[PDB]
Amino acid sequence: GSHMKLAEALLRALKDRGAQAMFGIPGDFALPFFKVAEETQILPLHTLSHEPAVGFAADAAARYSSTLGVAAVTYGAGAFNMVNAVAGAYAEKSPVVVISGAPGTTELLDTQFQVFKEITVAQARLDDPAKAPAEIARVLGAARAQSRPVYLEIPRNMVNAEVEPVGDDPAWPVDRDALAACADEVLAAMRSATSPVLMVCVEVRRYGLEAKVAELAQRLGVPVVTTFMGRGLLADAPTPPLGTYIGVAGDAEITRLVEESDGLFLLGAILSDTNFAVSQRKIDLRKTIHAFDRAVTLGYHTYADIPLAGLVDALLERLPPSDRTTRGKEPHAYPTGLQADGEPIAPMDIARAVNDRVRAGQEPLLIAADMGDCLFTAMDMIDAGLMAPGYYAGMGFGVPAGIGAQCVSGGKRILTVVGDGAFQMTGWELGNCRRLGIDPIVILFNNASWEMLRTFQPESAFNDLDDWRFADMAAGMGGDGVRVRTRAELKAALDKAFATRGRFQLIEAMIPRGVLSDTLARFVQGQKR
Amino acid sequence: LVPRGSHMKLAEALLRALKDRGAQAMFGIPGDFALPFFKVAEETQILPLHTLSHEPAVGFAADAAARYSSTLGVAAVTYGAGAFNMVNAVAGAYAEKSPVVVISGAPGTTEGGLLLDTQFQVFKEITVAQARLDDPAKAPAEIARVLGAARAQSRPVYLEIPRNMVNAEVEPVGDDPAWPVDRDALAACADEVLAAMRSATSPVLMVCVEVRRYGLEAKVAELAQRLGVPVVTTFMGRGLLADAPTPPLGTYIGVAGDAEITRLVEESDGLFLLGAILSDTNFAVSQRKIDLRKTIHAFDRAVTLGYHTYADIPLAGLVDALLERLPPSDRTTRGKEPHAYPTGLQADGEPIAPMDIARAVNDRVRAGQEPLLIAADMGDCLFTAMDMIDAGLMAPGYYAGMGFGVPAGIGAQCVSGGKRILTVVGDGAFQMTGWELGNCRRLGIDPIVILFNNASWEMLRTFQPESAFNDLDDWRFADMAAGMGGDGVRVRTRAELKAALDKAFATRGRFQLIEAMIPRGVLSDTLARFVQGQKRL
Amino acid sequence: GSHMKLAEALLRALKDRGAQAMFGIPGDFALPFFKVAEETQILPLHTLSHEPAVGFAADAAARYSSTLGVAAVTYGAGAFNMVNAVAGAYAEKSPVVVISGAPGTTELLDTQFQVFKEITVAQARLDDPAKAPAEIARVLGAARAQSRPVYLEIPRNMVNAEVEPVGDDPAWPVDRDALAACADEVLAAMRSATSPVLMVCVEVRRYGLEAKVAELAQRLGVPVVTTFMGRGLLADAPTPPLGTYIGVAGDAEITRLVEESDGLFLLGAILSDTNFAVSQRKIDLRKTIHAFDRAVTLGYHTYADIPLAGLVDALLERLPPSDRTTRGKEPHAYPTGLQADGEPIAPMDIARAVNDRVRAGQEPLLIAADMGDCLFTAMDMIDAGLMAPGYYAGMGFGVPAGIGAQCVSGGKRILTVVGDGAFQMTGWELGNCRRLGIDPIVILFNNASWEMLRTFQPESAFNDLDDWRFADMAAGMGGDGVRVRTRAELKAALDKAFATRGRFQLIEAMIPRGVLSDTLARFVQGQKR
Amino acid sequence: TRLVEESDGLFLLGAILSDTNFAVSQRKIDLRKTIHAFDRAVTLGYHTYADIPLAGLVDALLERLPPSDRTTRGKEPHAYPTGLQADGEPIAPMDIARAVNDRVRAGQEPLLIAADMGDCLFTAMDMIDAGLMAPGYYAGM
Ligand SMILES: Cc1ncc(C[n+]2csc(CCOP(=O)(O)OP(=O)(O)O)c2C)c(N)n1
Ligand SMILES: Cc1ncc(C[n+]2csc(CCOP(=O)(O)OP(=O)(O)O)c2C)c(N)n1
Ligand SMILES: Cc1ncc(C[n+]2csc(CCOP(=O)(O)OP(=O)(O)O)c2C)c(N)n1
Ligand SMILES: Cc1ncc(C[n+]2csc(CCOP(=O)(O)OP(=O)(O)O)c2C)c(N)n1
Ligand SMILES: [Cl-]
Ligand SMILES: [Cl-]
Ligand SMILES: [Cl-]
Ligand SMILES: [Mg+2]
């Protein structure tokens, strides 16, 4: 018989589901909601400067803990200013709960609702106190079940409406007969394949199925490969991945193994023609088994309403235990050996600088990367996780994602890599580190250029950018910046950054135009063909 | 048949069609799918190509350029993230009747799934017309149709160009197709409007946004003199008819404005809204504050009054029809300035308040400086700008979205032929898009920017002062200007403000950033009236 | 460069797609649209008395010619009063285009739009002249592709807006590889089955695939059976159906053949637990092949975007020609031999009366039946088609459907059978026959009872209805009515009705309570078990 | 009509607001000067009070007003048509109203009237009744 303000019921429902913080920027229509969030302290409230960062930070927080992210905005400009970040979270299967303030029920372009419907899997306007609890459960349940963003619009006069507490997600029971048929066909297909391959992908991480999938991989007995967004999965498994598939720029043997498989089990994979993703045009659709978005497709036919977790358990029930292991193999060889001299800096030198510290005893940091050669370089860095817009490829994610991740990392420092073009977009969010109580290390790749674009159209003058003095601007926003031009300066700056806590550390690495990471070089050489 | 032989690339035809319609530049940020299009733009130089740092600024700059010259604005982006990142700026342009032509690159017609097309569906919600130029034979007519729609309704439009179509040969783009015009309804409407104006006890003519967008100032000045009723402007009509025989008594902006003007408008029993946006946000004329039953609303090519709506009535046509029915008049209602601008800055050791910034600017003008056009962001900077003498004011007065300020000043100055722009912006808004100033050197511009730094989202504090989240940190913006190629100075006293403003005006060639420290709780007079007016109700 | 009023463009688009008439009831918001319809004469405009009849008549017209039906109503009460008829058309795969007038774009509960979205497959509010042509093509195209109702809302101020003519339906090209895979699996399943059965169902008729399916049936070589809504299909085919499956009340051999099949090919079937339909709980889901709603499901997996027509052509390409025929068999035995004496009337006597006339030389008439024992009786009548709510089971369809069908029959007379309860609902629509220029024969089964309900709960008094003198009321609404109590009177009345053209003929047959048709008797006996 | 539409203090105590048929329309009155008490809320002066039952608002107003013996009764405001001319002329809707009213004036206790939508409703407005039930706002037949 208890009841609470609608806003409080929502905040508690989010916390009940694992949310760790709420990022946001208020406005008139959202002020009452922000007041409840601040006064109740149910979720830590972190504000940022610009809405893109609110969305990227919530996305990063969701990815960091494989839970719900929370992004709060105000009606109109505020919400429209987060459309790109939300689209990116949708694209990369990250459940960001977008909460927008809205005009009261009694109160220029609804357009906003229509736009958000295009980039979320469920929406609700909480304008009826009696049904709000069920609607919140339905919408948050969809976010969790599909691992994609959702939209909640709260009229300002409803924030304080009394409602009953939010219950559990509505349960959608799987058809046992269909699941059995699905598991049987999938297993039969893997057994009939001359070259079966198990790809561990994004949904495995999002749904927290790492342990179950490590077990499945051991029992299935086929080669394991990860997709870009599955990087690091099963690293501690009995049969760790042979490597990561990233398309033309990756290991040739891995690329062929994936593309020539006649039993390619895409366990939770996002398919697209984007650079690093598994593309339908490069694989055998007559033999691929795509388990994704609560469905399983093979031989052009689909089993509906098959959650990934259920499929994995069904396969385990049909497989005998195994003690097989492949861990006696040699570990991956990362680029190391930075020559700390007076020579200029190349992207690979940044990778070597980071890797050398790790080899010398530094526990690796999780890396947040923006889109650009910084990402191609980060791929060769030893990390405690990599968070980047590898498929969506939108710029601006980097710095805000590092900030969002460190806000929920419980003390673990984050390393962010970002190019000059991307920094001009959202790097300024670092001015918020002092209030947030964080101190990320940021390596800014400054080549005074939109280099990825120059690489593919070198004759154009518009890719030449001005020389912005980012390191000189760091103090103005509360951080310690240093511009480095030589490998010796780079080595020294990285050590100093790790030795200095309390303020964000910005290392502005000057890189000449035309100098690329090894992976980007291979990508370019690959396209030419 | 597939076109062949025109020796004109689709992209070139589009750039030329835009130039034919008055476009003065193209702002944009490239990406893979848009590279071929940007190559044509750069190589042909049909329109000056200006790049910016972040897409919001591309949209705001294009919007500002459109507003500055009452023409088409052009914003070029790449498919996906690039385009989605400009949705807010485009929605703002739609909201304030500014024709921004959005041109997005797209996958080639024979190419090919991360979302769910999603992009087209989103843009269709914030534009008046759209076209995917994937058929060279139909491209010319589609361009004319879409650009024609932008000009007919003064709203943004969307053009999506598959990258393999950029260089496809096409025939030249013709003129805009004609929109419906009901001559019979026009005549009947004109008669009814005049009858309503004549019978009203307190009629009022409001000169609004469409009058400026459609270049009707001269015709409306003539109409105002002949109609013989009190004249007032809306926020977006501010400045119109200033030199006319019957100039506006003032600008209506709701409770925040002059009490006499507000009363005149809200008590009118014959309110003729000539081209007005009707909305309940910020400074817009609100359907909830006036009596729609006694209102004549001419907008979006229609006219509503007496419980009925006349369709297919272009504003220019209605004005001409009214003039044909009114005899000439020598009526003159000019007099000494209606709105008294604050002057007399006390250049001493006291802290700075928003009104001191208005006095500093106004004193320079009164001393002989030709006023600059002002670009303002949303915040107390806008409320303060209402009391500044200007050569035009560009701001999100209705949409109220932050981030517009600095990019708008940049876009306007790119097309101003050297006329310097004065930008006013708060600390919260500068944190969003003020960084775009780093592009001034390459763009060859040097705007003056007054940053109101109260370490606060102050407008929100006025609405909910109990909240701690409106307190912002100390950002040393002036100290960051050099890294962006400009001159910055932080000022704390009125004397420092006076000196810095003079130095900024005396120094061209580099943008000038004056970071004015202002205490929390100190508001412009207009924002103070706005806040008090809210409480009263 | 030509353009026309939006309303005219819609009417022509409907006529282009085969629509033969428009049924409707106007109101303030729809008056301008009705004016265009009346003045242009593009489609004959037929008004009725009450909206249920408008919907049932449009549904019947659609069914009669396997084309689009058109039902025009006014905003509010008018449209809400047609929700049941539209739901029934949706339930039975009939493409009724609902056109509602609406407030002008510049102008108590939108609720109406939301309600119609629940019972239609596509909707559009034509409030933008520039996009109206494409929206009309999209919505009408959905009606044709899915064979279900659609909704078009036209603001009154848009009726006369100038628009470009409507083009063709947007084309949704089928994936050739998926179709090939589907056809291969289906054919392999039919060949591996020990008892394959081809069921010809509603979509075969709706999409005009009778000739193609007759060919498929001959080449496939398996037994053919029809569903209730497939009654009469392939009657003239090389291998006509062995019979019609209608559940427990049908032929035992047919019921078992269907239910025990391990290769049940449901070609275009509506599945449901309703009386006469094929139910998922009575068949083997591990062996059923369900081709319906543009998909094909077997073994719990589904091939998407497979139009029925495409599937049939794909199977024909994989089957060799055949000269096989089963037409040497004995035809169906219908009840005949009415004893025209002084004894009371039973439902089977009505069937015998109708069948005897046919055996004596009368070309059979298409029969429109309402829900009740009249339908169970009609199942044993020789017809030129049977139109009834066999699956939806909603009352009131009968008389209006007969009226709608005769409006588009090009001179062919229609026979309607209806119970007293159903007649009290919509039988009054017969008052419109004079204006419509039609003269259907209507046999009203009057047992002063909701007999189907008494059969299952005989102890209830509320199923006892009063004695309404329907025949006595016929003249008041322009028809010739006669009440008959004996078999001799029945025989004479039916002959007189057929001999009298110009006015509807109402034969009110008095039937005692407790006297049922043979099929209903079997149904009841079946449920008991 | 003039009294209502020109009012600068229109207190709508429990009114349905709609533009259909006989309903009070937001387009005919000045909402700025209207006090709308309906659906357990009260709207006026550009703001809305929530959770206000109509019975509660009435009681609260009574508590703030002193008793009064004010009386504004007078001879019937609406003149009902009477005097049916019972002759050979055809029937018009007003004749039906006169027939009904004449019976009442002659001593018949009025009956409650149920009316459908159509001129029957417009005619019933001029009939003496013991209540009138009709779809006056919804206008459904
Ligand atoms: C929001 C957004 N706008 C534009 C692009 C197109 N784009 C892809 S790479 C690139 C250049 C990035 O420059 P930078 O951040 O300096 O890294 P670099 O290419 O020099 O390594 C651009 C503009 C994008 N991906 N996202
Ligand atoms: C894109 C966007 N996000 C949020 C808001 C809500 N908002 C309106 S005023 C304001 C504070 C502005 O702070 P500032 O720029 O420092 O100017 P001040 O109010 O202090 O004068 C905010 C966040 C908005 N209008 N637009
Ligand atoms: C619209 C609707 N309302 C109620 C029912 C429930 N119902 C099914 S059969 C029946 C009785 C029909 O009586 P009648 O038309 O006289 O035919 P009978 O049963 O006597 O053969 C009823 C009320 C229905 N199917 N449809
Ligand atoms: C269910 C429904 N359908 C259609 C209408 C539209 N309508 C309003 S008045 C009218 C005509 C009513 O005719 P009638 O009952 O004979 O009364 P009359 O207008 O002749 O006085 C119609 C069809 C409606 N209000 N309700
Ligand atoms: Cl993946
Ligand atoms: Cl305006
Ligand atoms: Cl069927
Ligand atoms: Mg760069």
Ligand SMILES: [Mg+2]
């Ligand atoms: Mg501020």
Ligand SMILES: [Mg+2]
């Ligand atoms: Mg009966």
